[PDB]
Amino acid sequence: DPRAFLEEFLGGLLLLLDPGHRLEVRVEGETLKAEVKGGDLGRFIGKEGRTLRAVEHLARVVLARRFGTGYRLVLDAAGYRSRAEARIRRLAEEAALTVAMTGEPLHLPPMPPGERRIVHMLLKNHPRVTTESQGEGEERHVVVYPR
Amino acid sequence: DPRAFLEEFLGGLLLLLDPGHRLEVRVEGETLKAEVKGGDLGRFIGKEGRTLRAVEHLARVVLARRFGTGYRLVLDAAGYRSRAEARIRRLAEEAALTVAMTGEPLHLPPMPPGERRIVHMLLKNHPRVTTESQGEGEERHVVVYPR
Numbered sequence: 001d002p003r004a005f006l007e008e009f010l011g012g013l014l015l016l017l018d019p020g021h022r023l024e025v026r027v028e029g030e031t032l033k034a035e036v037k038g039g040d041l042g043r044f045i046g047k048e049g050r051t052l053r054a055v056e057h058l059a060r061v062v063l064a065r066r067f068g069t070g071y072r073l074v075l076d077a078a079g080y081r082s083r084a085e086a087r088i089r090r091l092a093e094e095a096a097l098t099v100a101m102t103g104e105p106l107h108l109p110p111m112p113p114g115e116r117r118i119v120h121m122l123l124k125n126h127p128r129v130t131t132e133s134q135g136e137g138e139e140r141h142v143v144v145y146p147r
Numbered sequence: 148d149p150r151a152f153l154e155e156f157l158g159g160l161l162l163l164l165d166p167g168h169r170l171e172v173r174v175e176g177e178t179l180k181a182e183v184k185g186g187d188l189g190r191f192i193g194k195e196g197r198t199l200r201a202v203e204h205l206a207r208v209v210l211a212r213r214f215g216t217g218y219r220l221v222l223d224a225a226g227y228r229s230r231a232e233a234r235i236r237r238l239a240e241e242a243a244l245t246v247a248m249t250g251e252p253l254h255l256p257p258m259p260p261g262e263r264r265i266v267h268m269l270l271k272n273h274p275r276v277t278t279e280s281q282g283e284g285e286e287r288h289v290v291v292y293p294r
Binding site: 057 | 155156159162163164180190193194196197201202204205208209210212259260263280283284287
C-alpha cells in the first residue's frame with residue numbers, strides 16, 4: 001500500500017531528524033498529502049525549504065521505485081507551501097518594480113524549478129521586464145532583465 | 148562530531164532502505180567518504196544513481212545545518228562513482244562521433260550538474276561539436292550540437 005509505505009519510511013526518517021516529528025498522510029487519488037507536525041518545524045523546513053525538499057525528494061524517489069510513476073507526493077509543514085508560493089509572487093512583482101526603475105538586472109535567490117516557472121509565468125507578459133534562468137544545480141535562479 | 152553524526156543519521160536512514168545495508172565513513176580532512184555495503188546495492192544506487200544521490204543530498208543538507216559549510220560528504224557504493232564517471236566520458240566521446248556524422252543534435256540522458264560539467268569540459272575544444280545545457284530540474288541535460 002502506497003499510504004502505509006510512506007507512514008513507515010517517512011515516519012522513520014522523521015524520527016532521525018526529530019523524535020517529536022509526527023506524520024499524517026492523506027490520499028487524494030494521485031496526490032499524497034504528507035503533513036509534518038511536532039518538534040522543531042523550523043529546522044525541518046530548513047533554509048529556504050531545502051531540508052523539506054530534500055526529505056520530500058528522497059521520499060519521492062523511493063516511492064516511485066516501489067509504486068511506479070503514477071503517485072505524486074506533496075510534503076508540507078506549518079503551511080509552508082502556501083507562504084512560500086505567496087512569497088515567490090511577492091518577490092517577482094517587487095523585482096519587476098526594482099528592475100524597471102534602476103535599469104539593472106536583479107538576480108533572484110536560488111529556488112527550485114517549480115518556483116522558477118511561477119516567476120516566469122507571473123512576469124511572462126510584463127511590458128517592462130523579461131526573465132531568464134541562469135546558474136546550475138542549487139545555484140540556478142531567475143534573473144529579471146529590463147526590456 | 149561530524150563523523151559520529153553521519154554514522155547515526157545515515158546509518159538509521161540506510162536501515163529504512165535495507166536492513167542489510169552497512170555504512171563505513173572515512174575522514175579525509177574536508178571530505179567525508181561514506182561507503183555503503185551489504186543488502187541490494189543495485190536498489191540503493193537506483194536508476195542512474197538517483198536514489199544514491201537523493202540519499203547523499205539529504206545527508207549533505209542535514210550535515211551542513213549542524214556543522215557549517217566546511218565539510219563535504221561523498222557517498223558511494225560498489226564503486227559506482229568510478230563507473231559512472233567513466234561512463235560519462237564514454238557517452239561524451241560517442242555522442243561527439245554520432246553528431247559529427249549524422250549532422251543532427253543528440254540529447255544526452257539527464258545527469259546531475261557535476262556530470263554535465265564533465266561533458267562540457269571533455270567536449271570543450273572539440274573541433275566538430277559544441278555542447279549546451281537544456282531542460283530544467285531532473286530533465287536538465289547536455290545537448291551535443293554540430294559546429
